[PDB]
Design a protein around this ligand. Structure first.
Ligand SMILES: Cc1cc2nc3c(=O)[nH]c(=O)nc-3n(C[C@H](O)[C@H](O)[C@H](O)COP(=O)(O)OP(=O)(O)OC[C@H]3O[C@@H](n4cnc5c(N)ncnc54)[C@H](O)[C@@H]3O)c2cc1C
Ligand SMILES: C[C@@H](OP(=O)(O)O)[C@H](NC(=O)CCCCCCS)C(=O)O
Ligand code: SF4
Ligand code: SF4
Ligand code: SF4
Ligand code: SF4
Ligand code: SF4
Ligand code: SF4
Ligand code: SF4
Ligand code: SF4
Ligand code: SF4
Ligand code: SF4
Ligand code: SF4
Ligand SMILES: O=S(=O)(O)CCS
Ligand code: FES
Ligand SMILES: [Fe+3]
Lengths: 291, 652, 137, 183, 94, 92
């Protein structure tokens, strides 16, 4: 499997350990990650789509063209980028008026989208093309802990175009985390949003933290030792939001947060330093003691 | 004689005229060869419109008539009878569909719609020129009817036809008649005991001298046409001697296989050997071979030794004139709406399961209890429109009875336990018939039932207690509610029954967007189908309540009694025939007919094909496949269709 | 320029599907002109080839769903005939895409509308079929 | 009291026009199918902690109340798509909210924090750009000091600038190219 | 007429035409039942055929008469919103 | 957000008991017949200049919202009887 690795913004510029963890985990699973040189912001679908739809799709199609020129499909570890690039590709394939508008704009920069790019999320790529059995085979250090799985919103939704199954009762990530030796604990409002999406973190910070606080509380009540996600933004919201929750609401949890790549990395014998678990705002050390 | 065509362009008020420029189409029709009269009128099917055609046929000596209007599926018979009254053969009449196929679908493209109407008129005129006079074939009508489905609708049709003096056959799939009405405890808006009022009709139909009841039987084949149907009924084997069966029920105690009781909607557990419900008609037991292990333990306890595994199903061949489909409906499966947690949460039930829990002869002995701990719920929530008015589940229709049964069952629970708190989560309360609005007023005023306008977003279970929380916006307050309940009842909608696909193929009938059976016309013929001699009655035609199903049962009896009473019906002579001078007996046609009409025979010392006219249904498959052109379907001959194709581009 | 599309629809489920689209006011392009037959089994290569000869830019055929034919199996014969016809059209220089066959029930008014929209757009993009012009020389 | 004079009859059409051809006329016209059931509001995570009611936003668009564009409420949607998944009338709720926000931004109702995030993509090509700490972190982890992204590629940065100017997004957020900041 | 939006005439007029010339149906228009006596299967009814003041068998229904009548009566069929003549026909498809 | 714990389920019955026997059980029990049409609110002279909505007071009673007794809104009714005269469900 060969895929143009779209990095995005938060993973490459904030949580770099998530990148390093993905690079080795995907290599161990037999996936050749090729550099998507010059790739910019996806751009953020909820944030930019809200300011100007034409700009969101035109800039998204510009990134798709990079992978199309390389003659390979795209892979990403972020729901925001997945949702943005996947919905852009679908819309350009299904709507010719939108494709014409975008190609008329891309002609100014010597580009043209032809509709040959398929966008994939690393979690579903692992579930449908590689297999959950291959995860267990590569487990060097079984992580026997309770995990509050966080699917996010832009991973499975909208189901009408994603076609990755149920968004109300999914099993995809639960089966992937359970393959590392962990246990996906069921909690209240499991499929609810972390609160960061749609530009809410930047404009209404306290509102976004109220939703993250509820998710953390529900995970802790379910007996979770940590929470696993598939989105650098959800990861940021859970990891750094706790500092803001402590400074704004006065509530302290010190709840460990691990990205699926970082969780898969720990399981595949990666060194916590190579995984960069120490950099996290909220210390992962309490979780490292449990494993 | 050369064709003399009369072209009539209908306006249909403004349905056609408002989009298509009818006067301009009328002027264009006059430029076509053989067209000698062309007129446009507001309503061609009305008395003045029909009299105008008749008067012109006589005054202008027309031998062809073209009506550019609605669909032939609606008024082709109407105009055929109109032209026949003026002396013109009904097969010299041609329909041009410029409403459903043009004005109604090209409303924002008036000019192109007008040009399309001109081409459709030219295509009609082109086929009309080569149409030939055909003799309507007169056929006899077998004085016997067939009713498929023994629910309140089917029972009513059979009783009415039987009471009229017509021999009737009633086929019921399950071991007993009664349908879903037998599963209900009470019935809105009178709150009468459902079985206590249906049982007399079940008793009446079982001993009626003009009704032959075939319970635990299915129609496996239907062949023929109106007045001449040849049906095959498979009398399923109960593996228990029917006549030696007492109906006591002592051989079930020993059976080791537990099957979920269908009659109790899966809540109850029955054995492989059983009786649907205590008031079943006919009152006899049955063995389910789909779950039977053939251990023979039941036979050891059985005194009469009625148990016989060597029983064989009997195929009964019967001849009938008319058929009435009254197979009912099934309750919607709410597992798909995952946010509600049906099939996941123990205390989330459907309304049909509640009917059984409430029913005295039910699995809980008439006690409403939580399936998680067996305790009576103190707080109950009803969720309306589950599986209805929902594009996500593909059901964009109103199931018609859910508002009323939710309010009814809420009154029944309040009567049994007044302390119970009941909230109904709705969008619109649909209490549209006689005494329904009053029933709704009564539910709130007398029984204290509460109504929350707001369709719930999701149901959340407390894993510790089994209690459920209903998340919904109270739209009348603009606030989000998160009330807790001991039991959540999903007011499930109606869907076609599981066997509907099998019955559709056997009868050759169509379905409407809601997946129920299609009536010939929503207002001109609510219980007829486009297939002559086949009628509909009850919930299988669309979601509806008991009086509506009962009225449809009676309506179907009247409509199905017309051909029987007449004793003679007319069938379309659009059949295939072989030109002996051209057929060299290649045998290609023989296997193409599913009815076996074309057959090879000896004529003038050589082999040729010949069609048994009576077996031809007029599909046009064998003439299309004939390599010599000897085979032709009257009214759809290759030359006629060829001119119709030319008519789209030029006058032929 | 506007495409000239000819249609062949069976009287039971398809003609009924086109009527449902009309009753529900489901708008679609006005290029098609429908011809009524009792069954799709009545449709054979000669009618489609005759339509192209006359100047059709696109030919559409509609029948009951496989297994739901009013006459039990007329649509199975037409299905075998159309697959051969698709490749014969390509051998004659007629784009396979100029012929479209679909299975539409009486309840499928929305499907008929979208099939009409899709076929119209497909033929509009291909441009006019120049057979008649070549034969008129 | 709401009078006819306070309502705009074309509000729904104007929202639908703004959504044509992106995300699509059929997508945004779905707002006309809303039957005010409240399923969207009950599913909203933001609605449980604010005065924001998803259903009322659709109601305002249909009634013609222009103030919905000036409201802070439309900006409380996190675009989780839960309402979109559960709407029984197939209303593409999330897409309609993003479309209503486009008209809000054109009216000048765009938060400063959002114009800055929009400026980061215009200036550096990313909403969250790399800093001195990013370089030193990536170095110690074993990754390339600077990721192969638009931030460190003038060709790609100038490509986006040409598109942004053509789309008029720079004028929307009020960005001055000479000063390199928002007006 | 909902939900097909057919004209009311589409379904009704053919039925009106059929019932008026049916060999087994005797139509008494502009008539009223004034008395009913008896029981099931043995009813004795009195029908009052109201005088139209026009010979039905000789009448053509052309309406040349309506164009000459000088008195205007509110049309009951149009709910008082229309004006008819003393000599009238309820509606054109009557 | 309104939870079950914030509601007083017997508020409607409590209001009825306070009305028995004056002005009468049948008179006050009429609050259960309300179908939230809004005719009372549209007829209210006070509602045209305040946040008072007659229909919402009846709703708050049927739902069990305790604050209705602590609200200033119930004291804005001038007892003009216009809603009483126009109610199609005979709500006194
Ligand atoms: C929860 C609930 C509550 C309701 N409450 C009320 C109420 O209070 N009042 C009211 O008026 N209505 C109520 N209804 C509606 C009511 O159930 C229907 O009006 C009624 O059952 C219609 O009867 P039917 O004969 O048309 O179909 P059915 O009652 O479903 O009977 C159909 C019969 O045909 C048989 N059958 C099926 N397939 C075949 C086959 N292939 N061959 C032979 N036989 C076959 C079946 O076994 C069955 O006996 C309620 C519905 C539900 C779901
Ligand atoms: C990450 C954070 O930026 P800083 O880490 O503060 O530079 C954040 N920005 C944003 O919200 C920019 C939009 C990011 C969108 C990510 C979509 S997955 C904020 O200002 O709170
Ligand atoms: S099978 Fe035998 S034991 Fe069972 S009910 Fe019939 S007679 Fe009684
Ligand atoms: S033979 Fe069949 S019906 Fe009888 S006891 Fe065994 S499993 Fe039950
Ligand atoms: S009858 Fe009532 S509950 Fe049933 S679908 Fe219609 S509105 Fe919904
Ligand atoms: S297909 Fe034609 S030629 Fe062949 S046997 Fe039949 S009628 Fe004769
Ligand atoms: S046309 Fe031919 S194939 Fe069709 S029913 Fe008649 S004889 Fe049979
Ligand atoms: S869920 Fe859909 S129909 Fe219901 S209020 Fe929201 S947008 Fe409207
Ligand atoms: S998409 Fe927005 S309005 Fe819809 S549920 Fe999510 S946050 Fe609420
Ligand atoms: S039903 Fe047909 S003939 Fe009668 S008015 Fe309507 S379109 Fe014309
Ligand atoms: S003039 Fe009047 S009364 Fe005389 S035939 Fe004509 S319509 Fe009848
Ligand atoms: S007028 Fe009557 S029924 Fe209508 S809301 Fe007011 S009190 Fe309730
Ligand atoms: S009686 Fe009170 S609530 Fe009713 S209209 Fe008068 S002031 Fe308003
Ligand atoms: O913040 S965005 O809504 O644009 C994407 C969240 S993953
Ligand atoms: S009748 Fe439709 S395909 Fe045979
Ligand atoms: Fe009784």
């Amino acid at each position: 499997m060969k895929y143009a690795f779209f990095l995005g913004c938060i993973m490459p510029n904030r949580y770099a350990g998530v990148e390093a963890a993905t690079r080795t985990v995907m290599e161990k699973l037999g996936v050749e990650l090729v550099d998507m040189t010059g790739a910019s912001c996806c751009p953020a679908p909820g944030v930019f789509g809200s300011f100007d739809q034409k700009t969101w799709l035109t800039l998204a199609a510009r990134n798709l063209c990079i992978a199309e020129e390389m003659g390979v499909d795209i892979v990403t570890v972020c729901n925001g980028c997945y949702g943005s690039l996947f919905e852009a590709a679908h819309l350009l394939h299904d709507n010719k008026e939108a494709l014409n508008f975008v190609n008329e704009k891309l002609d100014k920069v010597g580009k043209e989208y032809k509709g040959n790019v398929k966008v994939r999320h690393f979690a579903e790529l692992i579930y449908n093309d590689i297999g959950v059995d291959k995860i267990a085979e590569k487990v060097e250090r079984p992580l026997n802990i309770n995990v509050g799985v966080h699917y996010g919103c832009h991973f499975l939704k909208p189901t009408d175009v994603k076609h990755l199954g149920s968004a109300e009762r999914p099993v995809m990530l639960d089966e992937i985390v359970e393959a590392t030796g962990a246990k996906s604990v069921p909690y209240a409002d499991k499929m609810m949003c972390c609160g960061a999406g749609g530009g809410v973190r930047a404009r209404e910070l306290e509102l976004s933290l109220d939703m993250t606080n509820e998710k953390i509380e529900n995970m802790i009540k379910a007996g979770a030792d940590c929470t696993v996600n598939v989105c650098p933004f959800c990861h940021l919201q859970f990891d750094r939001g706790q500092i803001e929750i402590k400074e704004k609401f006065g509530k302290e949890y010190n709840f460990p947060v691990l990205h699926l790549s970082q969780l898969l990395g720990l399981a595949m014998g990666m060194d916590p330093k190579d995984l960069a678990l120490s950099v996290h705002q909220i210390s992962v050390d309490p979780l490292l003691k449990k494993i | 004689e050369e064709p003399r065509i009369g072209v009539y362009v209908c306006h249909c008020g403004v349905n056609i005229g408002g989009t298509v420029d009818c006067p301009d189409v009328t002027e264009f029709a006059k430029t076509l060869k053989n067209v000698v009269v062309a007129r446009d009128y507001k309503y061609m099917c009305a008395d003045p419109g029909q009299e105008m055609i008749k008067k012109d046929i006589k005054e202008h000596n027309l031998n062809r008539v073209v009506v550019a209007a609605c669909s032939p599926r609606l008024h082709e018979p109407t105009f055929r009878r109109c032209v026949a009254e003026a002396g013109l053969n009904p097969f010299l009449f041609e329909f041009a569909n410029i409403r459903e196929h043009c004005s109604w679908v090209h409303m924002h493209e008036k000019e192109k719609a007008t040009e399309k109407a001109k081409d459709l008129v030219r295509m009609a005129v082109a086929k009309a020129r080569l149409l030939e006079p055909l003799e309507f074939i007169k056929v006899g009508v077998t004085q016997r009817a067939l009713v498929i489905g023994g629910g309140v609708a089917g029972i009513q049709t059979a009783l009415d036809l039987g009471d009229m003096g017509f021999e009737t056959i009633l086929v019921e799939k399950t071991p007993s008649v009664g349908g879903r009405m037998a599963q209900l405890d009470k019935t809105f808006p009178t709150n009468d005991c459902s079985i206590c009022i249906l049982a007399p009709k079940m008793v009446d139909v079982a001993k009626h001298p003009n009704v032959k009841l075939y319970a635990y039987s299915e129609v496996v084949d239907v062949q023929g046409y109106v007045g001449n149907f040849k049906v095959k009924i498979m009398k399923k084997a109960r593996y228990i001697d029917e006549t030696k069966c007492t109906g006591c029920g002592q051989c079930s105690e020993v059976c080791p296989i537990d099957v979920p009781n269908e009659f109790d909607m899966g809540i109850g557990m029955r054995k492989a050997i059983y009786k649907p419900f205590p008031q079943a008609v006919p009152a006899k037991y049955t063995i389910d071979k789909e779950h039977c292990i053939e251990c023979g333990l039941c036979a050891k306890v059985c005194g009469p030794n009625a148990i016989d595994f060597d029983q064989e199903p009997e195929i009964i061949e019967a001849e009938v004139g008319t058929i009435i489909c009254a197979i009912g409906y099934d309750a919607f499966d709410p597992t798909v709406r995952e946010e509600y947690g049906y099939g996941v949460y123990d205390n989330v039930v459907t309304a049909l399961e509640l009917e059984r829990m409430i029913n005295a002869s039910g699995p809980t002995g008439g006690k409403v209890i939580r399936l998680s701990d067996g305790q009576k719920p103190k707080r109950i929530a009803f969720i309306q429109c589950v599986g209805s008015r929902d594009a996500k589940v593909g059901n964009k229709y109103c199931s018609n009875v859910c508002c009323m049964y939710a309010m009814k069952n809420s009154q029944l629970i309040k009567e049994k336990s007044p302390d119970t708190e009941i909230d109904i989560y709705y969008m619109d309360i649909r209490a549209f018939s006689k005494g329904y609005e009053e029933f709704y007023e009564r539910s709130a005023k007398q029984y204290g039932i509460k109504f929350m306008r707001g369709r719930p977003s999701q149901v959340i279970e407390d894993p510790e207690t089994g209690n459920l929380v209903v998340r919904a916006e109270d739209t009348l307050l603009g606030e989000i509610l998160e009330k807790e309940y001991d039991l959540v009842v999903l007011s499930v909608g109606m869907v076609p029954t599981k066997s509907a696909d099998e019955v559709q193929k056997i009868l050759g009938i169509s379905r409407t967007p809601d997946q129920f059976f299609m009536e010939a016309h929503p207002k001109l013929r609510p219980v007829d189908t486009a297939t002559d001699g086949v009628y509909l009655a009850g919930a299988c035609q669309g979601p509806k309540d008991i009086p509506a199903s009962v009225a449809q049962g009676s309506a179907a009896a009247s409509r199905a009694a017309i051909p029987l009473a007449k004793g003679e019906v007319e069938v379309e002579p659009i059949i295939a025939s072989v030109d002996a001078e051209i057929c060299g007996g290649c045998g290609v046609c023989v296997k193409q007919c599913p009815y076996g009409a074309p057959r090879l025979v000896e004529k003038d010392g050589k082999v040729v094909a010949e069609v048994i006219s009576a077996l031809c249904k007029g599909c046009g498959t064998c003439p299309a496949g004939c390599p010599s052109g000897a085979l032709e379907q009257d009214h759809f001959k290759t030359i006629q269709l060829f001119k119709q194709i030319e008519g789209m581009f030029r006058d032929t | 320029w506007e495409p000239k599309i000819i249609g062949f629809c069976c009287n039971w489920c398809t003609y009924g599907g086109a009527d449902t689209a009309g009753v529900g006011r489901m708008q679609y392009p006005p290029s098609i002109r429908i011809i009524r037959v009792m069954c799709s089994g009545r449709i054979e290569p000669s009618l489609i080839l005759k339509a192209f000869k006359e100047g059709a830019d696109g030919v559409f055929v509609g029948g009951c769903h496989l297994g739901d034919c009013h006459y039990d199996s007329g649509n199975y014969k037409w299905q075998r005939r159309v697959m051969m016809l698709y490749e014969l059209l390509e051998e004659l220089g007629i784009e396979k895409e100029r012929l479209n066959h679909e299975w539409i029930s009486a309840s499928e008014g929305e499907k008929f509308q979208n099939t009409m929209k899709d076929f119209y757009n497909k033929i509009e993009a291909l441009g006019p079929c120049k057979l008649k012009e070549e034969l008129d020389k | 009291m709401i009078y006819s004079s306070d309502l705009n009859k074309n509000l729904a059409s104007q929202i639908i026009e703004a959504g044509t051809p992106i995300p699509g006329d059929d997508v945004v016209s779905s707002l006309k199918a809303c039957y005010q059931c409240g399923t969207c509001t009950g599913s909203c995570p933001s609605g449980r902690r604010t005065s924001y009611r998803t259903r009322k936003v659709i109601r305002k668009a249909l009634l013609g109340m222009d103030d919905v564009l000036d409201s802070d409420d439309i900006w409380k949607c996190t675009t989780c798509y839960t309402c979109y998944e559960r709407c029984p009338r197939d209303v593409k709720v999330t897409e309609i909210i993003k479309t209503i926000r486009n008209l809000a931004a054109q009216k000048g109702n765009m938060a400063k924090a959002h114009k800055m995030t929009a400026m980061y993509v215009l200036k550096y090509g990313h909403a969250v750009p790399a800093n001195k700490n990013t370089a030193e972190l990536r170095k110690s982890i074993g990754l390339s000091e600077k990721a192969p992204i638009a931030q460190f590629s003038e060709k790609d940065l100038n490509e986006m600038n040409t598109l942004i100017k053509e789309l008029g997004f720079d004028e929307l957020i009020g960005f001055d190219w000479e000063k390199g900041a928002l007006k």
